[PDB]
Structures are given as structure tokens and as C-alpha cells.
Design a protein around this ligand. Structure first.
Ligand SMILES: Nc1ccn([C@@H]2O[C@H](COP(=O)(O)OP(=O)(O)OC[C@H]3Oc4nc5nc(N)nc(O)c5nc4C(S)=C3S)[C@@H](O)[C@H]2O)c(=O)n1
Ligand code: FES
Ligand code: FES
Ligand code: FES
Ligand code: FES
Ligand SMILES: [Ca+2]
Ligand SMILES: [Mg+2]
Ligand SMILES: [Mg+2]
Ligand SMILES: [Se]
Ligand SMILES: [Se]
Lengths: 157, 420, 420, 160
């Protein structure tokens, strides 16, 4: 097995790394790039905790091989903050009560951001289906959704 | 109401910022220099004796720093949130599937798994008990001690044998609740190390750091003050993280290698090893009169606490005391028995045996409400607890009782939203 | 003498293990991911206003993240252990050589130095004051406010004018001590950062973390509960690490870059910038009767507190309260005047003015003993403080006074080991 | 400036590193090898806090270029411990009261050890001269010297 060269745009910057391909994209991000916001809750693509914005689209990084992130644009929770400050979405999650244990939060926010970056004014239903790939055992999903609805409204102005 | 400065208000939580920013670190997010990785070699049988265990080939792997069994423990090897019947590493015998037999520490996760697939073992299987029936048989093989009867409680209030004669209605039925698992989104994880000042430390996903401290210190024969447990940001527990998970296994390895030891359970191993809700069966008979006032409740329940006690003693006790719903019952009889089995370890899960008990009594009430043409709410409001009432334990409610309000306000809201 | 369970015993220190094993971490031993290095651009003139300051060329260097002057401080820019007369970064004017003017944060120590070398400045030099004589001349520029007189104290006890007339012997001499530096072996060092939960933090070599905190919080306009100061294993202080060293410069650079900022001072800069012992000159007249009994002490002293107050207040009063020595003197008068100068900042150095005072009171006692042909130890035992003695401040000693035992034990030992 | 390859035996093991030559051995040990026990108290050979055992002799690492550690055997404080436990010498510093702030300690211990490895039974005068390159601002050296003397006696004591 020979190491492969991987070029990608991670959190707004052009990165490049030569490493062994025998690993998942989740491992690459957590271990090689130190992005620990990307959680691993099941290892089978179910919980969504390992969700990251892969080319405008959210994806389960526990289902992808490191090499597949080549030539792609990836955004993890660390990339959401604006110059170290909580974005609008993040602020809404804070005030809405959408956060209990916080293990699912990164994925939730990334899924909600991916959505809002395509559909600024989504329907509550479009919001639901949009985040149906992320499981939470704490909130019942209610207040998480409210935070998204909250953000959209403040997005109007 | 009752004007408060900050109480009641929806203040942004003190730990939400780091959670939404992604800087918050859960156990598995911690990494240290020269940090080794750990894995646990567990049993594939449910009940047996370890005839032969070879760790020689595992240790011989270049990259594996340590492989240990109970012999490696300098202190005690019996733990438990209530009853010390849980070993850190099987010494006595296997009492369940996934029992901790040995632990490994290596430079990489794969080297951990490699060292694990190199271990061989021989069993002398016993009769795996899986039903409460076979477990009660004075004939069955004792999983613990010389009996499979873990807990037995009996509550006697007033005289039910009599009251059951002053009732115009009496309903009998058997209830049964299944086995469930907390399923917190964050799998069990922990990391142990000696800090810069020489302090043995364990960062871990837990619900009770201080309890964890005692056990670790016990395992290593160290005074509590010399063992530090740091409850890292925890991704849910719901009761599944009260029992020990990786604390002792990590610490044990850090004690022998003197290096940081990280252990992150896969979802599979996490679910396989953690405790489960107590599956219960409850035989009940409730007697009431025309008007609807309850006169006497009688219950006989059983419980499958699993291979180890865990919160079993607390589950049976709390269940016995609540089996007769939040209603005033002048006569109560309760017989409860929990037994050890080779089924997944039963312990604490949101409710402490009350959810199971709620099905039983609420099932009876709704049953009486159906046999008396009463509205499920009213028949409840009638027998609902109030300040001054007397409990099956002889205790009298002296304050904070808003059960009827939850019944009226709720019904009201239901009407407004579902047309009650 | 009281059978203590553990008190008095030569127990191994709770922190000696890390020190002998080399695991103990002093501030400079800390490193964090993405950590930047910092340096300070300091004045090379003693007293002057800044005409111009160019930071553009320093900012343009690839690898330099920040180059800040007082304009970058969001909160206050006046600090000080006792008197708030010290800036974090010079605003109105330079008052000493080595005054902090701007700070730099960069990816490597070499980049920092490169940034400092690229900063240019133009001063409008004022008169540098280096003698207390010139400082007291009212036409001399005022380093602070409208006068260079920093502190004044006067102790009047009994009546020395009357007393001296009743004396058989009076010794009068002018004493003076010099300027010294603490020279702890570990140079000033610190590192600041926001932790995982967003907590602003500063790990530093200090003697007073809680004081440090209040200052940092005041600079960043934050509540004390939101600024964490962690005193790292400290390589000695002796008073030189009471004043702020790197805490604010680091915290400020972290507040702006949001990254960890490490600042380790070269021995040179540490000495050049940290406090020094107050040099003092004490004019004393001590009187006594033939039997060697003290009747009156009169001291007129001056202290050079340097560019900033630091412990100037603490030094002048402590020195004033002790300058008659550990002896019962029924009549004492003390005049003390400490002045600001552009000399290095005088602060706290083991003794707070008493080492300087002892040179004086002991010099007097020895001249008395010699002239009266008494044994130096005897003349001291005769006038020594004892429980019950009345102090020059009106205070009467009520307990714990063993001066005579030190005197006797000391002489007894010296007779034996050095032939006293 | 081309990088160089430095081969040395560090704390018992053969290490190899390819690095820039423009750094002191002190920097190599502290930064590249993470041995923070090696202190920098002065940068000019005076304090002795950066002392390491070099080919059997105590040297000030702040006075040396990184490349000069090539083909050498170096022992820092981290390499004195025996299986994660305090060596006899270290146990003696613990008990003799030789440790106050502890900043000069790594240097003191290494210098003492360097002497004892050559001369197991030194005279008090020899102990002093041997450690005269290490400055201390806390102890007044009294107990540091006692610790070494105690180690020498206990070592002889181990004549069982
Ligand atoms: N009068 C009250 C009561 C509760 N609360 C809120 O609700 C929480 C629950 O408080 P409490 O009922 O006192 O229970 P504990 O804090 O002791 O939490 C343990 C409890 O919490 C439960 N809910 C959980 N919620 C989350 N997010 N994660 C778990 O693991 C949970 N596990 C369960 C289980 S099982 C248990 S035993 C408080 O932190 C508080 O934010 C409140 O504001 N005011
Ligand atoms: S770990 Fe990827 S979806 Fe759960
Ligand atoms: S808040 Fe805990 S899993 Fe979502
Ligand atoms: S730093 Fe090397 S002798 Fe002082
Ligand atoms: S113990 Fe502090 S310098 Fe030696
Ligand atoms: Ca626990
Ligand atoms: Mg200080
Ligand atoms: Mg001063
Ligand atoms: Se629970
Ligand atoms: Se001091």
C-alpha cells in the first residue's frame, strides 16, 4: 500500500496531505486535521453525528474513504464560526434551547446550514426532512427545529 | 408569579457555547503524547469457567505494550454501584456475554485489535439461565452465591384480603415490560493518565465521577485523594453511565505502563456491555367501588436483573413503592422478586423501574374507568394524591402536590388541541 | 514541646516528586497547538513622549499575526499592586528605560524579533531624573502628577528632643544600601489562551494569581469569574514576581488573535523590566545611658522608588515601623520620604525595607556596644523586646516573643562553633 | 542553509533526527525532543540549569550547537528514573530537603549523578567542586549537598 496525495478545501482554506488511504474520511478529519467536532456515534451512518458539509451537501463521513475527499470542499463545525464568533445559526441554537448533551449538535448545525445555504426560506417540513438524517436522544428534536425556524426568520431582515 | 430575579428565565446554558462552536471535548476527543490505545477481550459464552487462557502470542506483537488479566490487579477485583458482584476482569467465572476477561494496550487501534484476535481461550460452559422461571428453580445453577434470588421485597399496607370484599368491582391482569438500552448518542469513552504532578487521572463520560473514583482507587489500593476523575463533557447517559465502563480498565493499564491509555467503545461493544432496563412482569389485581374510589391494590412482580446486580436493589425497591399509582389506596399488598440470569446486565434506565410499574397501575385504572363509564381523568382526579393523604408506607404528604392540576390543565389542553 | 502528630516533621514536600522527576512544568514548559510567540517593543530612553510610532512594517512581515499598542486595549490601561500608576502599554509617556510600548505575536520567536527590529519610533526626550536630590527639586519635571514625592511618613513616639539631652552616649551616622535584583533562576514566563470551554486563561510564573486576574479582567473589561489565572510551578520570586510581568501582554494578544500566546523572557529583559530593591539612605541618631539602655532613636530616611510605585508604599511604612530595631526605645521619631525617579522600578524584594533598616539599627547597636565596651549580644539582650514591651506605635507585645532566646542560643552556638 | 542529520543516544535509546543546524542543543532537547526538564535560566552557561550528561560529563546545553550532539550519548533528568520510579539519588533529593522551587534541580541531580557514575564514593570537597556549575537562589546549597552525601552513604549501605 502506497500513501496517496489528497488535495481539498477544508474550512475555507486549501489544504493538502499525503497519507495512507486505508481510513475513513471521519478519521482523516478527526485525527489528521484535529477536527474533533466531527463525532462518531455509531460507525454505520445512522446517527449523523459525523455529518460534515461535503460540497454543499451534508454526508456521513463514517461512510467515506479518506481518498474520496480529494478535490472536494469540506466544512465542519469549526468552519462555521465567523472570525471566532457564533454565526447566526449557532446563536439561534444557543438561545432556542436546542442543546442538551450537545453530542449531536455539530451534525445538526451542519445539516441546517447546508439547507439554509441553498434554501434561505424553507418550510418547516423542508426543515424536518432536511435534518432527518441526524438522531438526538435528548431534545425530542422540538427545540432543535425551533432554532432553525428561528434562524430563518431572523434571516428575513 | 412569585417574582424571581433569574429563576425560571430561559438563560443560555453555561456550557452551550462550546457545544455549538465545536470546541467542547467529549472523552473520545482527548489525545495525549505517547498515548496508547486500549481494547477489551470479552467472553463469547454466557456462563462458564475459563479452563485455558493464552496471552503469550498477543504480548509478542511488536507494538503491543501490555495484555492483562485479573492477576494484574494490585487491589480489589469486585465492584458495583450497590452490590460488589462485578469483577474488573473475570477471575471467578463468566456470568454473561461480553464479560471482561482481559485488556490490551497498544500504540495503535489496529494493533489493539490484532492483539485481541491473537488471544485464545477455552471454556467449560455451564447452564446459561435466560428465563426467570428456570432461574427460580431451586434446581438451577447459582450464578451468584448459592441462589439466583437477588432481591425480595414485601410491602403490606392495611388489609387487602378484607377490602377485596368491600369492592363492587375488581380487575385482574398480568403486565409485562421488555428490555431496552439507553442508546445515548455518544459511545462509552475514557482516557487515563498520570498528570505532570504524578496524579493518576481518568477523563471519562460518566454520571457519577466520585463513585468512579472510589472503585479505581480500590482497584489500585490508593487513597481516594490520590485518584482524580474528571467528568468530561458527556453525550447523554440516561442511566447507562452510572456503572463503571472503562475507568478501571484504562487506569489499570496506565498503572502498569505509566502511559496515557485511551479507550473508545464502538457502538456495538457499548450496547453489548452497558446495562439495560429491567424487563418486568407484574401480576395485579385492583379493587374499587361504584363511585370509583380505590379500596385495595395487590401486586406480585418479578424482575430479570441480569448477570449482575447493578441498580437492581434500587429498581425493585422503587418499583415496589410506586406500583400503586399516584392515587390514594387504603390497602396495599406488594410482592416483588428479582433474579440473576445470564441475560444482559440490568441496571438503571430513566425511571428506576417506575415506567414498568406505571404501565401496570395505569393499565388497571384505565381498565376501571372503562368498567364504570367514567372519564379516565375524573376517576383519577378522584383518587389523586393531595396534601394530607396517606401513602402505602404510612407517610403523609405534607407539601408540593399538584397532581390534580396536571390532570385538569392537561385534559384542558388536550381538548383545545385534540378534542378530548 | 507539644507532641504533634505530624507538625514539625521533615515530610517530603507534596510537590517535590515532579521536581526531581523532571515532569514538573514551569510556565515556559507549556506548549499548545497553534500557539503563537510574543515579544515586547520597549523604550530605549528613560523619560520621553512618543512623537511617532510605526508598526506597519512589522505588521507586513509574513508570519506576524499582531502588533499592538495601547489603542488595542478594550478596558483600562493603568495597573499596579498598590497604586495604579503603571500602564500596560505606554500611552501618555515613557517613564523608564524598558517601558513597554507595543507587543507582537508571531508564529516563531525569530519572527517576533524580526517584527520588533522592524518597528521604528521617535521620542521627544524629557529630562531623565536619576538622583533623589534632583527629584526633590520642585522645578524638576514631575514623572507622575505634580511632584516626584511619592510617599511620606512620620512616626512620633514619646519625645526625642527631651530624651537626647538625658543621654550619656549618642551615636550618629548616615547609612545607605544599594539596588539589587531578585535573580530567581527561572526567568519570567507565561502563556495565555481560551480553553476548550472558551475560558480566558493565563498560566504564569507568579506569586499572586488572584491579583493578576483582577488586572487582566480589568484590561479586557471582563468579570473576575471569567478570567482564569493558573500559577504554574514557579521557579522562585522573592518579591520580584508580585508585579505583573507577562500576564496582560499575553492575554491581550490572545484576546485579539484568539490563539494561545507564549511569552518567555530572556534573563536580560526579565532583569531590566522587573522590580528592584529600594536603595535607601538613612540618617540616624541613637541615644542611650551609660548602662547601655536605649533612650531615643531618630531616623530621617529617603528611598528611590524608581519609575513606578510598585511596593513603594509598603516599603516606606514597613521600614518606618521597624527602623528602631527589635528593641524597647521609649522615644522615637521617624521621617521618611520616598521619591519617583526614572531609575529602574523599585518594588518588593525579600524584607520590604527592613534589610535596609537593619543595616541602620544594628550598625547603631554595635557602635554603642563598642563605645560602652559591652558585648554586642548583651547590649541587645538588655534592650530586647519581651512580652509586655511598649512599641513605638503604641502597641504592647502580648505574646510570641523570643528575641532573647535567639540572642542567647546564637551566642552559645557561636562560642562553640566559631570561638565567640 | 541545508539541514543536517544528528545521530545520538538519548536517555537510553538511539535517536535520529534531520533538522536545521542553527539551533542550540538546549533547543533541540527542549523543542524537538520535548525534554522540558532541561531548563533555560540564563542562556550564557552560568546557571547550569540546562545541564545534561554528555558522553559522561555535565555540560551546559545552552553553550552548544545542536549538531554537536552527533555521535553522543546524552542523559537528561527524564532518563534518570528507573522504570518510572525515583532513582536512589532522586529519592535522596526528595528526603534531604534539597528541593525548594525545583528549577535548578534537574541540573543539580544530573551533575551529582555524573559524579557518582565516575566516583561512587567522593569526598565532600569533591562533591562541592563537582556541582559548582549549578546556581541556586533558594537553598543556599546546604541541603542539595546533603542529598548527594546521603545518596553516597546509602549506596555504600547497600553492601548486603
Ligand atoms: N425544577 C426543575 C427541575 C428540572 N429542571 C431542568 O431539568 C434538568 C433535570 O433536573 P433533575 O430532575 O433534578 O434531574 P438531574 O439533574 O439529577 O438529572 C438526571 C436525570 O436527567 C434525565 N434527563 C437527561 N437529559 C439529558 N440531556 N441527558 C441525560 O443523560 C438524562 N438522563 C435522565 C436521567 S435517567 C436522570 S436520573 C435540570 O438540569 C434542569 O435544567 C429545571 O430547570 N427545574
Ligand atoms: S458515526 Fe457516522 S452516522 Fe454515526
Ligand atoms: S442533545 Fe444529546 S443527542 Fe442531541
Ligand atoms: S541556561 Fe545554560 S547555563 Fe543557564
Ligand atoms: S531550589 Fe530554587 S533555584 Fe534551586
Ligand atoms: Ca460511571
Ligand atoms: Mg504577579
Ligand atoms: Mg517603586
Ligand atoms: Se436511570
Ligand atoms: Se519581597
Amino acid at each position: 500500500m502506497n500513501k496517496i496525495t489528497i488535495n481539498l478545501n477544508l474550512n475555507g482554506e486549501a489544504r493538502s496531505i499525503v497519507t495512507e488511504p486505508n481510513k475513513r474520511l471521519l478519521d482523516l478529519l478527526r485525527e489528521d486535521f484535529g477536527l474533533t467536532s466531527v463525532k462518531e456515534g455509531c460507525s454505520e451512518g445512522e446517527c449523523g453525528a459525523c455529518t460534515v458539509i461535503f460540497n454543499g451537501d451534508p454526508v456521513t463521513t463514517c461512510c467515506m474513504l479518506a481518498g474520496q475527499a480529494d478535490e472536494s470542499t469540506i466544512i465542519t463545525l469549526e468552519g462555521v464560526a465567523e472570525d471566532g464568533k457564533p454565526s447566526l445559526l449557532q446563536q439561534c441554537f444557543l438561545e432556542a434551547g436546542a442543546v442538551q448533551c450537545g453530542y449531536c449538535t455539530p451534525g445538526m448545525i451542519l445539516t441546517a446550514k447546508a439547507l439554509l445555504d441553498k434554501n434561505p426560506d424553507p418550510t418547516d417540513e423542508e426543515i424536518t426532512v432536511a435534518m432527518s438524517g441526524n438522531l438526538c436522544r435528548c431534545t425530542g428534536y422540538i427545540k432543535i427545529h425551533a432554532a432553525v425556524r428561528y434562524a430563518v426568520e431572523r434571516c428575513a431582515n | 408569579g412569585k417574582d424571581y430575579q433569574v429563576l425560571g428565565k430561559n438563560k443560555v446554558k453555561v456550557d452551550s457555547l462550546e457545544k455549538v462552536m465545536g470546541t467542547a471535548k467529549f472523552a473520545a476527543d482527548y489525545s495525549f503524547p505517547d498515548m496508547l490505545y486500549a481494547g477489551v477481550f470479552r467472553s463469547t459464552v454466557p456462563h462458564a469457567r475459563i479452563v485455558s487462557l493464552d496471552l503469550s502470542k498477543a504480548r509478542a506483537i511488536d507494538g503491543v505494550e501490555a495484555v492483562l488479566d485479573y492477576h494484574a490487579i494490585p487491589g480489589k477485583n469486585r465492584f458495583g454501584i450497590i452490590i460488589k458482584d462485578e469483577p474488573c476482569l473475570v477471575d471467578d467465572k463468566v456470568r454473561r456475554y461480553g464479560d471482561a476477561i482481559a485488556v490490551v494496550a497498544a500504540q495503535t487501534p489496529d494493533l489493539v485489535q490484532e492483539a485481541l484476535d491473537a488471544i485464545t481461550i477455552e471454556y467449560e460452559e455451564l447452564e446459561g439461565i435466560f428465563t426467570m422461571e428456570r432461574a427460580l428453580e431451586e434446581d438451577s445453577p447459582a450464578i451468584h452465591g448459592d441462589t439466583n434470588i437477588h432481591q425480595v421485597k414485601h410491602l403490606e399496607y392495611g388489609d387487602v384480603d378484607a377490602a377485596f370484599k368491600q369492592c363492587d368491582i375488581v380487575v385482574e391482569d398480568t403486565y409485562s415490560t421488555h428490555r431496552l438500552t439507553h442508546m445515548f448518542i455518544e459511545p462509552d469513552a475514557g482516557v487515563s493518565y498520570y498528570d505532570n504532578e504524578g496524579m493518576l487521572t481518568v477523563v471519562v463520560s460518566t454520571q457519577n465521577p466520585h463513585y468512579d473514583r472510589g472503585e479505581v482507587a480500590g482497584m489500585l489500593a490508593l487513597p481516594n485523594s490520590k485518584v482524580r476523575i474528571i467528568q468530561a463533557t458527556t453525550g447523554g447517559g440516561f442511566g447507562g453511565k452510572l456503572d463503571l465502563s472503562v475507568q478501571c480498565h484504562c487506569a489499570l493499564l496506565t498503572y502498569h505502563t505509566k502511559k496515557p491509555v485511551k479507550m473508545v467503545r464502538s457502538r456495538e461493544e457499548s450496547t453489548t456491555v452497558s446495562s439495560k432496563r429491567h424487563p418486568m412482569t407484574m401480576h395485579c389485581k385492583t379493587g374499587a367501588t361504584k363511585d370509583g374510589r380505590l379500596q385495595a391494590v395487590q401486586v406480585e412482580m418479578f424482575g430479570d436483573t441480569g448477570a449482575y446486580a447493578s441498580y437492581g436493589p434500587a429498581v425493585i425497591t422503587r418499583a415496589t413503592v410506586h406500583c400503586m399509582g399516584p392515587y390514594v389506596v387504603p390497602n396495599v399488598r406488594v410482592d416483588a422478586k428479582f433474579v440473576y440470569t445470564n441475560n444482559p446486565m440490568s441496571g438503571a434506565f430513566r425511571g428506576f423501574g417506575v415506567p414498568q410499574a406505571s404501565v401496570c397501575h395505569e393499565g388497571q385504572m384505565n381498565a376501571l374507568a372503562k368498567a364504570l363509564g367514567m372519564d379516565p381523568i375524573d376517576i383519577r382526579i378522584l383518587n389523586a394524591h393531595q396534601v394530607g393523604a396517606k401513602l402505602a408506607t404510612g407517610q403523609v404528604l405534607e407539601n408540593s402536590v399538584g397532581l390534580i392540576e396536571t390532570l385538569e390543565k392537561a385534559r384542558e389542553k388536550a381538548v383545545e388541541v385534540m378534542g378530548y
